[PDB]
Write a protein that binds this ligand. Structure first.
Ligand SMILES: CCCCCCCCO[C@@H]1O[C@H](CO)[C@@H](O)[C@H](O)[C@H]1O
Ligand SMILES: CCCCCCCCO[C@@H]1O[C@H](CO)[C@@H](O)[C@H](O)[C@H]1O
Lengths: 207, 207
């Protein structure tokens, strides 16, 4: 039914474990949006508590810096109880998906959105898909995307590829994302570093 | 400059080597388009001849069946000599890219397009990106996509994800694609089989 496997605890990667970046982009707060990708109760429940805790603590530190620095915050979130037509081919790998109840669809309390933050409805793997994220970024004059959330190798990475494709420089925060296993996470980082993003740790972002 | 590594010969995967499909879609010619992805001279030149040969022979058998069966053929192809603005962030991983000369941009002779085949201009990793592929598929009443070409883990896979996202059932032809290494190819197949496609061999398609 969910498409989500049993997840074993693993350590988030450190600066020294990161693949080398081949790009040379530099994050400027005035240009940037922080995408908090799918940090909903339903997607964090499969994580072992040690991994959930590390994830959320980094994502929260990232979000406070962004706020201190003038970076636009944005949240993606699936609506829940998608109808059969709305769900489409997600059904075949992921089931009917989460319910539209607070217990599933709420952003976790530690990342609670504020009134200036963009709220995007999430339909498919990419945050840009059937959303107004791109149009909003253009209209705010922001052309850099900082990414955090879950799952690294699926929506996070596809959102990264879409931003890149739109000539928006992405910054993938390697210890403020989580995944199905350490090997999935690592492969997402390798792919990002050589095909669509700068990969950085939360500390590196905060400088 | 090109972003494309030195490529070592490897065998195309056989039916027995394929990851298990988790989906249960079945290809119907009347519903389908064959996407011949980026089978241009410039992208095939880095392949060792043994790998190029196997690739093109399967892609050609696939294309003849498709034609015999009523499947709509479509080709993506980069225009060549992209300007700096047109190239955008491709520059940072792939250089200025191919020239607009026949020696770079032509579809290889063994896959020569015919007058009924769709010709799409390729701008970014996905075939759907800044193209009319989706609109054309909708207008032809076709909701299945068969994919062949290069490179498996980059444009081919991202094109697959985009089709899937649009509720178009994809069919990734595992021995009619090629990649940077066997491990890249295999990982693309694993990703497709569990996240966005049916993975099949050319023989399996021809039945
Ligand atoms: C499903 C897709 C899986 C691919 C994961 C790895 C993607 C990035 O692969 C990278 O390829 C570069 C050559 O281009 C190599 O030099 C790098 O060492 C490797 O990390
Ligand atoms: C850069 C992205 C790299 C990821 C490559 C593998 C993607 C598919 O990974 C799959 O995950 C399933 C759990 O969901 C496992 O059961 C499978 O054995 C594994 O092949």
């Amino acid at each position: 039914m969910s498409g989500i496997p049993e997840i074993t605890a693993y350590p988030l990667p450190t600066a020294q474990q990161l693949p080398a970046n081949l790009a040379r982009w530099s994050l400027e707060p005035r240009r940037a949006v922080l995408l908090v990708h799918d940090m909903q109760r339903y997607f964090l429940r499969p994580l072992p508590e040690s991994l959930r805790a590390g994830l959320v603590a980094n994502a929260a530190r990232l979000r406070r810096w962004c706020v201190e620095q003038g970076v636009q915050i944005a949240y993606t979130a699936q609506p829940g109880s998608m109808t059969e037509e709305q769900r489409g081919l997600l059904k075949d790998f992921w089931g009917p998906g989460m319910r539209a109840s607070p217990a599933d669809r709420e952003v976790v309390e530690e990342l609670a959105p504020g009134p200036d933050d963009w709220l995007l409805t999430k339909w498919r793997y990419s945050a840009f898909f059937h959303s107004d994220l791109l149009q909003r970024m253009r209209a705010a004059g922001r052309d850099q995307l900082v990414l955090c959330g879950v799952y690294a190798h699926v929506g996070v990475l596809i959102s990264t590829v879409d931003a890149y494709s739109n000539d928006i420089q992405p910054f993938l925060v390697a210890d403020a994302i989580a995944d199905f296993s350490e090997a999935h996470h690592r492969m997402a980082l390798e792919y990002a570093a050589s095909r669509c993003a700068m990969v950085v740790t939360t500390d590196e972002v905060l400088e």
